[PDB]
C-alpha cells in the first residue's frame, strides 16, 4: 500500500483532477499547470516509477469532451500533453500519438527519454499503418522525427533513431545529422542490418551508409559498401574523390582482391602504380616470400600425401604395378593443387612429357591445365614453360596448354594481354577440343573483366550451329563468368536466343544445364531484373522451363537471404513426384547459396540439410552434399565433416561421391590432419572402386591445396564482401557435379579447374607506404564480439602474437598490437599498408 | 611430516621450519631500500594506524648506530629484539676496537644471531628480514630468517617483494642514483608501485655520507610525490 508522502501526493492529484468538474476561470490554468509541473518533474528524472502516473487512474472521457469544448487556445494543449503522458503508460496508441501531434508542441525533450522512445514506437506503428492513400498525416510525423532523431543522436540512442528512420523508409537525415563520434556505430548497424532486411530497403540503406561514409571521408569503407551495392559509377566517384595516394594504393589492393578492374584515366597521378597493383602482378612474388617464410618451398609428391607407408598393404608387390588412367588423373590433380602457386614441382617440371604420355585424351587436357596450375600468378614465368607443351606432338593437347595460360593469367592482368592474343586466333578453331580449350582459357584468364571486345568475340560461338553441345555449354559459362553480376543485355539476349533456337532433343543432354548457367552467371546478386528473365524463360516448355527458372532464381538471389525465395525452393524440394529431380537438386543448391549470405541463415540451412538428408528421396540425398560444400567452403566445421563422413559410406554411389567432394571443398586448404586421416581411411575402404578412389584423392588434393595456404572462400572483408568470380566458379563446379558420372567422371574433368578461378590466397604481408614489406607484431585471434552493438571490431580474443607475414585460418582475424603504425584499412586482410604513426613520441 | 621441527632434514634436504619462517616476512609491509653515490635511502610502507593510535611507537626504520640504520619486515617483537641486540653488539664492537662498526660487520652479526636460533630445537627462528644500510662507501645488505645475508644495490622486502623488485631492476640505473634527489625520487616511485595510497603511507629515511639520519617529514615527501607526478604527467 501507499505511504504518508504517497497518500498526500495521491490526495493532491485527486483534488487537482476533481477540480476540473466545472468551468471556473481559475481552474484550467491552475490545475493543468500543476499537473504539467508534477508530470514534468517526475518524468524528467531517473527511471523511478512515475508516481503521478501510478496515482492517476481516472477517465479522460470527460477530459476529452471538455478538451473539445473549452479554450481553443493553449489550455486544450496542456490537457493534450497531460493525457499523452498518462496514455503512454496505458494503451492509447493512436490517441497518445495524436495528443502530441495536435496538442502543445513545446518539445519531446522536455518530457523524458522514455516518452521519446514511446512516441517513436507509436510513430513507427502509425507509419506502418499508413499507406500511400494520404500524405496529410505523414508530414507532422516527419516533423516529430525531425526532433526525435537529434535527441537519440545526442543521448547515444542511435538504436531507436536508426530503427525509426528505417520504419519511415526515409534515411536522408542521417547524412546531415550524424556526428564524428557516432558515425562508426550507425554505419556498423546498417552494414549488419542490410543482410537481413529484404528488398528493396537493403539497397537504400546501403547507399545511405555509402553517403555517410563519403561525408566522413572513410574511403576504404565507402569502397566496401560500393562493391556491396555492385555499381561501378559510385566506385568511380570514390576513386576520383580519393585525394590521399596511400588510400588510393589501399583501395587498389582491395579492388585487386575483389577482382574489380576499372579503367583509370591519365588525369590521376601515379596511374601506372595503381594499375600494376590492381593487376595484382606483385601477389605471386609476395606469395613466394610467404612460402620462404614458412620453409615450404619444397613441393610435395602424391605418394607422401596419400601416405602409402601407412596404408595396410594387403596385396604386396602384385596389385599396385598397374597404373590406371583415372588414378593418374587424380595424382595429376594432387601433384598440382597441393604444390600449386609455389613456382616448382619435382615431377611435372623435370619429367613433364614422360608424365603426360601416360594419359589419354582427357588426361592430356587435365595434365596440361595442371601444368599451368602448378605455377600461379606468373604470366611470363608460366607461359615460358607452357609454350613448349603448346608446341606438343599431340596437337589435340594444345587446347590444354591454353587452359594453362587461362589458369596462369587467373588473378592477374598484363598490359599486352598474352591470353587475349594467344586465344584470338584459336577461338574460331573448328576442332571441338581446340575451341573448348580456347574459350575456357579466355574465360579463366578474364574472370570478372566484362570487357566488350572479348564478349563480342565470344558472341559468334553461340550462333554457330556447328559448335557442339559441350562447346556451347563451356562458351556460355565462360561468357557468364566474364560478365559476372552485370546483367549484360548483350549476353542475356544472346543466350536467350541460343536456348530458344535449341531443340528439345538437343536440350535433353546434361551440357544444356550450362546454358542457363551463363545467363544466371550474368545476374548474380541482382534479383530485381529477373522478372523479365523468368517471363522470357517461361516460353520454353517444362521440365527444363522449371529447371532454368530455378537456376536463375538461385543466381538472382546469391547471398540475398530472401526467405520467400528459399520457401519457394523448399516447396520445390518437398514435392515428391530423373530430370524431374534436377529441379529439386537446383533448389537445394539454391537454399545453400541464398543462406550462405548470413551466418545465422547458413547454420539453420545446416539443420534443414540434415532434415532433407534423413527424410528425402534419392535425388535430394545426392543434391544436399553439394549444398553443404557450398555453405562452408574452406571452413572445416567439424559437424559438417562428421555428417559428410557418415554419408561417405552410403550405399548410393552418387551420394558418396557428392559427400567426398563436399569433404574436398569444405576442408579445402585447411590442411586438417583429422580430415586427412578420414580421407586416407576412405581411400583404404574404397580401394576397389576407381571412381571413389579418384574423388577421395581429389578431396585430399583439395584439402592439401597450397600446403594449407590457399582457400576457395568466395567471401572477403570479415566474410562480408562477396566475390562474384569465386561464386561463379563454385556454381559452375557444383552444377557440373550434379551429374558426377557424365561430366566429372566423363569427359569434363577440366571443369574442376574452374575452382582455380576462385583460388584466392591468405596471408598477412604488411607493406610500408612505398610498398616494401614491413614486419609488424600482430595480435591474432577469434573475432567473437564480447559486446552488443558497441561498434567494436568484434573485440578479438584468444590472442596469439605473430610476426608478419602470418597465416589466418577461416574464422580467425588479426589486429595491430603496436600503436607505432596505423593501417589505412582497419580490416587486416591480405596485403595492407601501414602509415607510420605521427602521434607516437619516442 | 618433516615440518614440525627445525633440526630435521626433509627427504629432499629441506629445513622446512626455516622456510616457514620467511612467510612471516612475506606477511609484513613492504620496505624498500637503495644506495646512491653519496646517500643511502630506504622507504617504508607506513600502513595507516587507527584513529586513536599513537604512531610514535610504530617504528620500522631503526638506526643501529650513527653510521648505520635498519628497516625490517616481519614480526614486530622479533624485530625489536634483533634491533636491540644489533645496537648492543655495535656498541660492544666500538668498545673493543676503536673504529666504528662496519655495515658488513653488523649484518654479519645479525645473520649469525638469526642462524644460531635456527640450529637448535626449542628455539623459534626470528621471523624478520632486515635491510641494513650504512657508510664505512655506501653499502646495503639484506638478512634472512634463515640466517643468510647478501649485498644489494637495491631491495624491497615484505608484502610487495616480487613486484617492487621487478620495478626496481629496470629502474636502478647509474643516472638514477646520480643525484640524491633522484635516488629519493626513485625510492618514492618504487614504494608507490605497491603502496597504493600515496604520501600518507610512505616513510622514507635518508642517510647521507658522514651525516646523520633524517626521517622525511610528510611535507618533503609530499613535495617529492608532487614532483614525481609532474614528471609522469609527460604521458599526455
Amino acid at each position: 500500500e501507499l505511504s504518508e508522502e504517497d497518500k498526500q501526493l495521491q490526495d493532491e492529484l485527486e483534488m487537482l483532477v476533481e477540480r476540473l468538474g466545472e468551468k471556473d476561470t481559475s481552474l484550467y490554468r491552475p490545475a493543468l499547470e500543476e499537473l504539467r509541473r508534477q508530470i514534468r518533474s517526475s518524468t524528467t528524472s531517473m527511471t523511478s516509477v512515475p508516481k503521478p502516473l501510478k496515482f492517476l487512474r481516472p477517465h479522460y472521457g470527460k477530459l476529452k469532451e471538455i478538451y473539445e469544448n473549452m479554450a481553443p487556445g493553449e489550455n486544450k494543449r496542456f490537457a493534450a500533453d497531460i493525457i499523452s503522458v498518462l496514455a503512454m503508460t496505458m494503451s492509447g496508441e493512436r490517441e497518445c500519438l495524436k495528443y502530441r501531434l495536435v496538442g502543445s508542441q513545446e518539445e519531446l525533450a522536455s518530457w523524458g527519454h522514455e516518452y521519446v522512445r514511446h512516441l517513436a514506437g507509436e510513430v513507427a506503428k502509425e507509419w506502418q499503418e499508413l499507406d500511400d492513400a494520404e500524405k496529410v498525416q505523414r508530414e507532422p510525423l516527419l516533423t516529430l522525427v525531425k526532433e526525435i532523431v537529434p535527441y537519440n543522436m545526442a543521448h547515444n540512442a542511435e538504436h531507436e533513431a536508426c530503427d525509426l528512420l528505417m520504419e519511415i523508409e526515409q534515411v536522408d537525415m542521417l547524412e546531415k545529422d550524424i556526428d564524428e563520434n557516432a558515425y562508426a556505430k550507425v554505419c556498423l548497424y546498417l552494414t549488419s542490418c542490410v543482410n537481413y532486411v529484404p528488398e528493396p530497403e537493403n539497397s537504400a540503406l546501403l547507399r545511405c551508409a555509402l553517403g555517410v561514409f563519403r561525408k566522413f571521408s572513410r574511403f576504404p569503407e565507402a569502397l566496401r559498401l560500393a562493391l556491396m551495392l555492385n555499381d561501378m559509377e559510385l566506385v568511380e566517384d570514390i576513386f576520383t574523390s580519393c585525394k590521399d595516394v596511400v588510400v588510393q594504393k589501399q583501395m587498389a589492393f582491395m579492388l585487386g582482391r575483389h577482382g574489380v578492374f576499372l579503367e583509370l584515366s591519365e588525369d590521376v597521378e601515379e596511374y601506372e602504380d595503381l594499375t600494376e597493383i590492381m593487376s595484382n602482378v606483385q601477389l605471386n612474388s609476395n606469395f613466394l616470400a610467404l612460402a620462404r617464410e614458412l620453409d615450404i618451398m619444397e613441393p610435395k609428391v602424391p605418394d607422401d600425401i596419400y601416405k602409402t607407408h601407412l596404408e595396410n598393404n594387403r596385396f604386396g608387390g602384385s596389385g599396385s604395378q598397374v597404373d590406371s588412367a583415372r588414378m593418374n588423373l587424380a595424382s595429376s590433380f594432387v601433384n598440382g593443387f597441393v604444390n600449386a602457386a609455389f613456382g616448382q614441382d619435382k615431377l611435372l617440371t623435370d619429367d613433364g612429357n614422360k608424365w603426360l604420355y601416360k594419359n589419354k585424351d582427357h588426361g592430356m587436357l587435365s595434365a596440361a591445365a595442371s601444368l599451368g596450375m602448378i605455377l600461379l600468378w606468373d604470366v611470363d614465368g608460366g607461359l615460358t614453360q607452357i609454350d613448349k607443351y603448346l608446341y606438343s606432338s599431340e596437337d589435340y593437347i594444345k587446347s590444354g596448354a591454353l587452359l594453362a595460360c587461362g589458369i596462369v593469367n587467373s588473378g592477374v592482368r598484363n598490359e599486352c594481354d598474352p591470353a587475349l592474343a594467344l586465344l584470338s586466333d584459336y577461338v574460331l578453331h573448328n576442332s571441338n577440343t581446340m575451341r573448348l580449350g580456347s574459350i575456357f582459357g579466355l574465360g579463366l584468364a578474364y574472370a570478372g573483366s566484362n570487357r566488350e571486345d572479348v564478349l563480342t568475340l565470344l558472341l559468334p560461338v553461340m550462333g554457330d550451329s556447328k559448335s557442339s553441345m559441350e562447346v556451347a555449354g563451356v562458351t556460355a559459362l565462360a561468357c557468364g563468368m566474364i560478365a559476372v553480376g552485370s546483367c549484360n543485355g548483350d549476353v542475356t539476349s544472346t543466350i536467350l536466343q541460343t536456348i530458344m533456337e535449341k531443340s528439345e532433343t538437343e536440350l535433353k543432354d546434361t551440357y544444356a544445364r550450362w546454358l542457363p548457367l551463363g545467363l544466371g552467371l550474368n545476374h548474380l546478386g541482382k534479383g530485381e531484373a529477373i522478372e523479365a528473365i523468368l517471363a522470357a524463360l517461361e516460353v520454353v516448355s517444362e521440365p527444363f522451363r522449371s529447371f532454368a527458372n530455378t537456376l536463375v532464381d538461385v543466381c538472382a538471389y546469391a547471398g540475398s537471404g530472401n526467405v520467400l525465395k528459399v520457401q519457394q525452393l523448399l516447396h520445390i524440394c518437398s514435392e515428391h513426384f530423373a530430370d524431374m529431380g534436377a529441379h529439386q537438386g537446383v533448389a537445394v543448391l539454391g537454399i545453400a547459396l541464398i543462406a550462405m549470405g548470413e551466418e545465422i541463415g547458413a547454420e539453420m540451412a545446416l539443420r534443414t540439410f540434415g532434415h532433407l538428408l534423413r527424410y528425402g528421396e534419392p535425388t535430394l540425398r545426392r543434391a544436399v552434399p553439394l549444398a553443404l560444400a557450398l555453405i562452408s567452403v574452406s571452413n572445416p566445421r567439424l559437424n559438417i565433416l562428421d555428417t559428410l563422413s557418415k554419408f561417405s559410406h552410403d550405399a548410393d554411389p552418387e551420394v558418396s561421391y557428392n559427400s567426398i567432394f563436399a569433404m574436398g571443398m569444405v576442408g579445402s586448404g585447411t590442411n586438417n590432419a583429422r580430415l586427412a586421416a578420414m580421407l586416407r581411411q576412405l581411400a583404404q575402404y574404397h580401394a576397389k572402386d576407381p571412381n571413389n578412389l579418384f574423388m577421395v584423392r581429389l578431396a585430399q588434393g583439395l584439402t592439401h591445396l597450397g600446403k594449407g595456404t590457399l582457400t576457395l572462400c568466395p567471401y572477403h572483408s570479415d566474410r562480408q564482401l562477396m566475390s562474384q568470380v569465386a561464386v561463379a566458379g563454385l556454381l559452375t563446379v557444383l552444377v557440373s557435379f550434379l551429374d558426377v558420372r557424365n561430366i566429372i567422371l566423363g569427359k569434363s574433368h577440366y571443369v574442376l579447374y574452374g575452382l582455380v578461378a576462385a583460388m584466392q590466397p591468405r596471408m598477412l604481408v604488411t607493406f610500408d607506404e612505398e610498398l616494401r614489406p614491413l614486419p609488424v607484431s600482430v595480435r591474432v585471434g577469434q573475432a567473437v564480439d564480447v559486446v552488443g552493438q558497441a561498434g567494436k571490431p568484434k573485440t578479438i580474443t584468444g590472442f596469439q602474437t605473430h610476426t608478419t607475414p602470418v597465416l589466418l585460418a577461416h574464422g580467425e582475424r588479426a589486429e595491430l598490437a603496436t600503436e607505432e603504425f596505423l593501417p589505412v584499412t582497419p580490416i587486416l586482410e591480405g596485403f595492407v599498408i601501414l602509415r607510420k604513426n605521427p602521434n607516437y613520441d619516442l | 611430516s618433516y615440518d614440525r621441527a627445525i633440526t630435521v632434514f626433509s627427504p629432499d634436504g629441506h629445513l622446512f621450519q626455516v622456510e616457514y619462517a620467511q612467510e612471516a616476512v612475506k606477511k609484513g609491509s613492504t620496505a624498500v631500500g637503495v644506495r646512491g653515490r653519496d646517500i643511502v635511502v630506504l622507504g617504508v610502507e607506513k600502513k595507516s594506524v587507527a584513529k586513536l593510535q599513537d604512531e610514535r611507537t610504530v617504528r620500522k626504520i631503526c638506526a643501529l648506530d650513527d653510521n648505520v640504520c635498519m628497516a625490517f619486515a616481519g614480526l614486530t617483537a622479533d624485530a625489536r629484539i634483533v634491533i636491540n641486540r644489533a645496537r648492543v653488539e655495535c656498541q660492544s664492537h666500538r668498545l673493543t676496537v676503536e673504529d666504528p662498526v662496519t655495515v658488513e660487520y653488523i649484518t654479519r652479526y645479525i645473520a649469525s644471531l638469526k642462524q644460531r636460533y635456527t640450529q637448535s630445537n626449542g628455539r623459534r627462528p626470528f621471523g624478520i628480514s632486515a635491510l641494513i644500510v650504512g657508510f664505512d662507501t655506501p653499502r646495503l645488505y639484506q638478512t634472512d630468517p634463515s640466517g643468510t645475508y647478501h649485498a644489494w644495490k637495491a631491495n624491497a622486502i615484505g608484502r610487495g617483494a616480487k613486484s617492487v623488485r621487478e620495478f626496481l631492476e629496470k629502474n636502478y640505473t647509474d643516472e638514477a642514483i646520480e643525484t640524491d634527489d633522484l635516488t629519493i625520487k626513485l625510492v618514492i616511485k618504487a614504494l608507490l608501485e605497491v603502496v597504493q595510497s600515496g604520501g600518507k603511507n610512505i616513510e622514507l629515511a635518508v642517510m647521507r655520507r658522514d651525516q646523520s639520519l633524517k626521517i622525511l617529514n610528510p611535507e618533503e615527501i609530499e613535495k617529492y610525490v608532487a614532483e614525481i607526478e609532474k614528471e609522469k604527467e609527460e604521458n599526455e
Binding site: 531517473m46 527511471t47 523511478s48 538504436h159 531507436e160 536508426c162 530503427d163 528505417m166 548497424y189 549488419s192 542490418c193 537481413y196 532486411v197 526467405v563 528459399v566 520457401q567 523448399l570 524440394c573 518437398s574 514435392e575 515428391h576 548470413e598 545465422i600 547454420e603 539453420m604 539443420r607 534443414t608 532434415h611 527424410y615 528425402g616 572445416p636 566445421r637 567439424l638 559437424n639 562428421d642 563422413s645 586438417n672 590432419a673 583429422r674 594449407g708 577469434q782 567473437v784 564480439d785 564480447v786 559486446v787 552488443g788 552493438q789 580474443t797 584468444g798 585460418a809 | 612471516a24 609491509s29 610504530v58 620500522k60 616481519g74 614480526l75 614486530t76 617483537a77 624485530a79 597504493q196
Partner: protein
C-alpha cells in the same frame, strides 16, 4: 564407428540490446524454423515395398521381445542365451540376424515364446550413463568469461585445438593433453569454463557429478564408470567432465569402512580408465575440484591428468572484466564508478561479482529504479560480501 553426438545449439543472436537488429536476427531464426516445420510436416503427408519386409520380419519375431545375455555360440544358428532371470536356454538364431554382431556377453533380442534369437540389441546403455550425455549445449560461451586468458588458452590447447587443428600436434610429434583438472577456490570459473567449452566444442560432452557415478550395489560403481567410459569411446571425439572429483578422488588410505573400500575401488576403476592397460583413445577428461591437495596422487599424476589449471581469485584487471561482462545487460548510470568496487582487497571472486551485480539490481528495484547507481553497488558490496569471519591474524607483523 558411431561418430560423435554433438549437442545442438541455435546461432547466437547479437547484439543483446533490445533493438531492431536483434528482432531481425530472431525473426530469421523463426523463419528458418518455420521452413523446417513446413517441410517436415508436408514430407510424410505426401508419402504414397519394404512394408512386406517389415510385415515378415516383425511377424516372425513377434512382440514383446525379451532381452537376454548371449553366453555361447554353439552353431551358426544356435546359441546358449541367459535370460534376465539367470536361466540359460539353448535357443536358435533366426536368419535375419547379423552373425558378426553376435559376441559373448552381448544383449540379444529373443522371441517371447520360444526365446529364439530374433535380433541383437545394440545400445543397451545404462540410463544413469545416457543421462550424462549433453543434449542442449549451455548458453555460456567464451565471451562470457572475463580474464582467465591463460586458463582458457590451456583448456583450448588441451581439449579444443586438437579437434580443430591436429596438424600442429601431428607435425611436431606431441600427443595432445588428454586430461585437465580445473582446481582453485570456489566461484572462480571452473564450472563456467566447462560450460563454455561444452558450448564451443563440436564433440560429444558427458557431464558427471563425481557422485552420480557411485551406486548402491557392491559392484555397480566401477561397472558404471566402465560403462560411462565405454560410451565415451563409442562416440570417438568425446569430452568427459567430472565436476567435484573430490567426491571420489580423495586420497587412498587403509580402514575397514566397507563402503569406503568400494569408494576406492570405484576411483581405482576410474584411474584405470584414464591410464591403465589398453589405450584410452580420443576421449578427453576435464575434472574440477575446490580442494586438490586432498586428491590421490595416482589420480592427478601426469599421463592420467596431463594439466593442472589453477583458478586464482581474480585480480584487478580480471575483476574489472567480470564487472564489465556482468553489467553488460544492465543500464548503468553516469555517476557509477565501478573502479571503487574493483579496487580494495575484499578477495571477491567472479561469483561474488555476479552476486554484487544482482544485489545492486535489487537495490535499484527497492528504490523503484530500473537503472543502477554507484550507491546501490556500494550497498550491495557490504550486503553480499559478508562471507568470511576473520581469515586474518592480528597486528603482529609490521
Amino acid at each position: 564407428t558411431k561418430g560423435p553426438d554433438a549437442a545442438s545449439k541455435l546461432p547466437l543472436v547479437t547484439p543483446h540490446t533490445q533493438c531492431r537488429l536483434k528482432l531481425l536476427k530472431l525473426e530469421r531464426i523463426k523463419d528458418y524454423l518455420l521452413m523446417e516445420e513446413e517441410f517436415i510436416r508436408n514430407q510424410e503427408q505426401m508419402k504414397p515395398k519394404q512394408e512386406e519386409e517389415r510385415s515378415k520380419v516383425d511377424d516372425l519375431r513377434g512382440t514383446p521381445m525379451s532381452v537376454g545375455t548371449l553366453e555361447e555360440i554353439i552353431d551358426d544358428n544356435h546359441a546358449i542365451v541367459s535370460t534376465s532371470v539367470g536361466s540359460e536356454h539353448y535357443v536358435s538364431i533366426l536368419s535375419f540376424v547379423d552373425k558378426d554382431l553376435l559376441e559373448p556377453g552381448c544383449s540379444v533380442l529373443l522371441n517371447h515364446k520360444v526365446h529364439a534369437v530374433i535380433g541383437v540389441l545394440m545400445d543397451d546403455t545404462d540410463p544413469l550413463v545416457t543421462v550424462m550425455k549433453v543434449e542442449k549445449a549451455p548458453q555460456e560461451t567464451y565471451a562470457d568469461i572475463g580474464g582467465l586468458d591463460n586458463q582458457i588458452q590451456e583448456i583450448k590447447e588441451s581439449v579444443e585445438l586438437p579437434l580443430t587443428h591436429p596438424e600442429y600436434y601431428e607435425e611436431m610429434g606431441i600427443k595432445p593433453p588428454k586430461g585437465v583438472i580445473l582446481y582453485g577456490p570456489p566461484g572462480t570459473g571452473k564450472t563456467l569454463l566447462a560450460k563454455a567449452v561444452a558450448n564451443q566444442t563440436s564433440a560429444t560432452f558427458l557431464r558427471v557429478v563425481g557422485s552420480e557415478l557411485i551406486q548402491k550395489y557392491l559392484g555397480d560403481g566401477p561397472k558404471l564408470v566402465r560403462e560411462l567410459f565405454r560410451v565415451a569411446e563409442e562416440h570417438a571425439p568425446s569430452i568427459v567432465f567430472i565436476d567435484e572429483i573430490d567426491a571420489i578422488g580423495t586420497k587412498r588410505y587403509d580402514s575397514n569402512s566397507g563402503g569406503e573400500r568400494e569408494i576406492q575401488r570405484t576411483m581405482l576403476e576410474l584411474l584405470n580408465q584414464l591410464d591403465g592397460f589398453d589405450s584410452r583413445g580420443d576421449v578427453k577428461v576435464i575434472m574440477a575440484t575446490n580442494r586438490i591437495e586432498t586428491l590421490d596422487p595416482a589420480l592427478i599424476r601426469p599421463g592420467r591428468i596431463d594439466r593442472k589449471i589453477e583458478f586464482p581469485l581474480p585480480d584487478e584487471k580480471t575483476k574489472k572484466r567480470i564487472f564489465q561482462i556482468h553489467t553488460s545487460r544492465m543500464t548503468l548510470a553516469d555517476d557509477v564508478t565501478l573502479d571503487d568496487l574493483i579496487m580494495a582487497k575484499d578477495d571477491l571472486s567472479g561469483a561474488d561479482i555476479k552476486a554484487i551485480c544482482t544485489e545492486a539490481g535489487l537495490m535499484a528495484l527497492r528504490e523503484r529504479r530500473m537503472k543502477v547507481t554507484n550507491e546501490d553497488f556500494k550497498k550491495s558490496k557490504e550486503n553480499v560480501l559478508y562471507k568470511k569471519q576473520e581469515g586474518t591474524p592480528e597486528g603482529l607483523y609490521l
